[PDB]
């Protein structure tokens, strides 16, 4: 199988470089990719926010901070590069069909943010269909999908299975919200609809056996018509 | 003044060109640049949509869709370009950074799409927000933007003028009509209601004389907060 | 054996794309790259001239021109590229070496135009020099080559066998001619001459059969010493 | 006159950056830019080293831990533009002849690193070089050149003048110490050695008024032959 | 006036370059640049030739071979612009848009070769053409145009003017001769029987003064309609 | 086992370029390149030091002239490029990645330099800690490593094997020799020493038969803690 990890820079960088992650997700994906073909897109996170706040106090245009971003998480993406050890491409990837030339090297392509104008989340559900992927695994800093916001509506439970309309519904159906961050953002959540590829909805710990997520041995929320 | 022009690759290339109209408006173009800031999006209209049926024919994922798309649309900004002689920028644009250095070598711009994941219209209106544009030209291939479309509900006349909160329902606002076509571009609709910039859309007649246009007098849509 | 197949846009696209001939081209490629190797370019046709004209009226240079008809080339080339499916090469390849590794990854490179100042034969003649290749394939309007222009000189028949310097004569020895059309162009059937590589110069008929094309089982020209 | 400014990441972006002196050095640059031909290469501070020490970990080579401090000085180099507004080229510049273009568009071109194996200083100081700069202000995180470090020997005070011999020794001379920092890294100082430009070295607070400290007036080293 | 100076290699860069010559025709140039615009395009020379040869012997492509020619002219191309100092384009320019841009920035764009398939002379005047340049000198290592080649057939002596034509069979227009040498490459001898632009061709000797030489006042040969 | 050749380009190219070594070494690598995976690395010799003195003549930047030096460095590596026919990377590498690419398609990278600020020791020495090398090998134009300069102190000896720490001390443990020549120019020393890879330092006459260099079985030096 073909897979695809969307690692929420929140995840990978909460304040620092969470070091420990690091070395298990990658240990887990060095594993995983033993018999499966593994790509990889990793979040800017905290350190990104704060980077694009500086611009934004000098009025930079929404394109010239999405380029700042971009910048962070390409050096976020470069942390598991290392990690990664021999088996990832070399350098970070900027593009699908260089993506795919690294899965063809039978190498783990670790990206970045693409160009201006995208989450990772969709960045992730992009590379995923280009790739022809099976499975787009999302880890990020909730448990999976609710009903509503963990962290908000006390009335809100986490789904086990879903259809991509549903989801659409909870993150968000609106034009507005085009470009936001959620569990999943609504445009790659969109995406996701559209291409009606199965993704996996896990957290920092699910992540740790991706053996299990990978079969369904998880705790998490699975997307797929 | 900063104005940025959305022309519809359908209006400088129907179906099979119409030397006198592109003369007409690169020649246009030429004069408004004299004393004014001018960048130009192109767009790949009819020619753009077979192409990319074709691949849709054989399930090509929507990146590689957009590249199709993306490569038409900059064949188009070339005729253009062919057009405004020793005025424009010698080679089509692909990003914001060399449309900014063509303004500065006081030549005009002119671009096709950028990357995937921008219908021309977003990609004019983020570089009109790029460039601290004043205004933003949409000549589509339609009069104005109508309470519905016209080749639909006949019930429907032009509206003057509007707030961008009204376009983004006139295109409807739904989190999957992203990417469409209509009058505007659905998301770069809802990034002009954000970037507040005021925008007129017209057509090819109103399209004869720019200055008329830029300066308020004209036929189609001027919307704005 | 690796082979190179130059296929004559005007064939690809006659008017508009013929879906069907690409369908079945495509199908008949994927069928002869499961045991050779296989790169192919592709012309501008009919919609190449088009929009070359336009340029003309502006009086822009051979160069700006060519330019114009490589991006449609490599329009024309990713329809190819989307109906051979994941066989081909992710995107439009634009160079030899980017060729060449697309033939080590097991895939088919499909070439539009390179630089300036090559038609699609020339470019693929050296295409297949650089690969070293075993066989150069043209698919063409035309049955086959014809000791004159089949469409004019009633005194014109069919070659089935010829050196290439016999080619050289038919077509053109004029160094004026260089960079014409005809069956083979000028300057193409100059390199073929100077590389002595087998050519083969087939119709939109042969070409539904590829394998016999290939062991000669076929009703058009042969080229070699 | 050409200067060159070669200010630290950990004084434009300490900890988390100081929006106030990132304005007032800006504001300033645009100033001296006015009569002056400036250029700017930016530090990537603490935050690079943290992420080099990260990959430090993985055992990854010296280049890749260069790939990732170069990938974070730009994300800086970004936040200084932003600040320098429409006075500053729009990109951070790599190479150069990128660098010097900006000075011909009269724009003041920001830079990161270029590419491995050139820590800050040297790429500052080797831009000097090439621009055939005038003066090198070095806008370190300390006061002055010390006969020693500061945090190590308090028996140290800073040392107003000096040549540039006198400075290979205060920072350790020894063919191993190529790649460190201190308040001017090693390699660096033995270009400037050999190419005699005039340098200065202060701290963010002479840093607070470049007129007075380009103009002799500070209180921090002014190393030259 | 634009002017576009075709540079032989062998008169650049000798056997060993001529650094008097050099300065001498670097300063010229800077003159003529000075109520003109310059465009010079460079050859690879001897050197070019040997480095071929060892290609050629072991039977590498003809791309190859012309990727080794142009890596070689680049580099004297180099030599000229460190003569032309600060009133040349910093770096050699190998695309005729980049050649005007330095056009723009009024300074003086070197170029060496652009891609395969093009010799420095056919460059030169694809540049002539595409710049429109007004006139065409060909700084050759020949005194000028002679009925034949000087070391073959003493029964020779130049032709101070003639029309394109003539020069196409003095250089024999056979289709095979196309990428020959000659005091004028065939191809591009074709290249300006069809653009008419007026050619002139002189030695070293008369090009040590360019101003006289573009004034018509020269013992080499004036080509044109 | 994974080997880096670091070729001098005395060695290569003493004169003009050395046919006969070059089909040998040609010949000797494509032997090792069996059962091993080889980069190379070419020096630019007697031609690229007379390249860098004309622009010294025109007091161009250190930077300037490195560019010029690589440029030929360059020229001489496609030299090998087409001795190793069709087991060589098809075209010249210019950075590690694409070398680790080569690698991985089974093919042999020939690199010139890298970017301006690396002698090809030091390109070599990192080219190997990037790939993560076993074995450095240094073809020069002398017998091994001696005590004292041969050509020189006749009280000098050749050494059979040594530390690392014992390199840098012959070569140079001055951070002034930073960018010199040398058997081992002092930065790579350095770098061999920091990387502690194995290191071979033979002659053009060990070259003629690399498997018993490779196996020890020859007559240099080798470096290792
Ligand atoms: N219905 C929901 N279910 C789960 N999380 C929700 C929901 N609604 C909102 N959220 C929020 O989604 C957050 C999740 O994602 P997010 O903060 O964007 O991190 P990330 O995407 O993992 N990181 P990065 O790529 O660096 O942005 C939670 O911590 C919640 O505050
Ligand atoms: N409310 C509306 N007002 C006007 N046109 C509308 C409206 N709603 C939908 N449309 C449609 O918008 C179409 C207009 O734009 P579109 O087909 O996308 O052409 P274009 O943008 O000019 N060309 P190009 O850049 O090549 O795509 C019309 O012909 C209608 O079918
Ligand atoms: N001796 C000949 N034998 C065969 N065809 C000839 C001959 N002489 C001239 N022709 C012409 O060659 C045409 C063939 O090629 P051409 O029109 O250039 O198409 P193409 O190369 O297949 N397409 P494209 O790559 O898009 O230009 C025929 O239809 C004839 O009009
Ligand atoms: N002789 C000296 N005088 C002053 N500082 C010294 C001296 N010797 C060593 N140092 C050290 O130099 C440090 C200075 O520079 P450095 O840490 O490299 O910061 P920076 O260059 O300003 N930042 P950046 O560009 O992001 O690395 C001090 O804090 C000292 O620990
Ligand atoms: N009719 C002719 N008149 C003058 N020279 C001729 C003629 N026919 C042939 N030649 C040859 O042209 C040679 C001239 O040009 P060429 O050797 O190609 O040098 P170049 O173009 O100056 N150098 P470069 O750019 O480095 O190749 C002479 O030395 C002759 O051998
Ligand atoms: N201790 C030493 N042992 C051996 N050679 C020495 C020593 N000290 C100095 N040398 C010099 O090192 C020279 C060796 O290398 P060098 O001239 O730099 O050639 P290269 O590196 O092989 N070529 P290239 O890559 O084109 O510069 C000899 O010929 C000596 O003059
Ligand atoms: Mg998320
Ligand atoms: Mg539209
Ligand atoms: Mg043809
Ligand atoms: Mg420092
Ligand atoms: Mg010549
Ligand atoms: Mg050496």
Redesign the interface.
Known sequence: MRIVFDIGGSVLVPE??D?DF?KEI?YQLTKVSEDHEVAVVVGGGK?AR??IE??E??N?????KD??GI??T??NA??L???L??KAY??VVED??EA??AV??K?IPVMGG?????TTD?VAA?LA??L?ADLLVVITNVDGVYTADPKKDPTAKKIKKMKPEEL?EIV???????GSSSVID??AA??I??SGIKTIVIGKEDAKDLFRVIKGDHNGTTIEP
Chains 1, 2, 3, 4, 5, 6 share one sequence.
Not at 172 to 178: D, L, N, P, S, V
Request: aromatic share 12%.
């Open positions: 620092n470089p070091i690091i990658a350190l704060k980077y500086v611009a106090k000098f930079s245009s929404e394109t010239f380029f700042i910048q962070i390409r050096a470069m942390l590069i290392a990690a050890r021999e070399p350098v699908f069909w795919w030339k063809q090297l190498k693409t160009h201006p104008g995208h969709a992009l269909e280009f022809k659409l968000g159906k609106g034009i507005e919200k085009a609504p445009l969109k995406i609809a559209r």
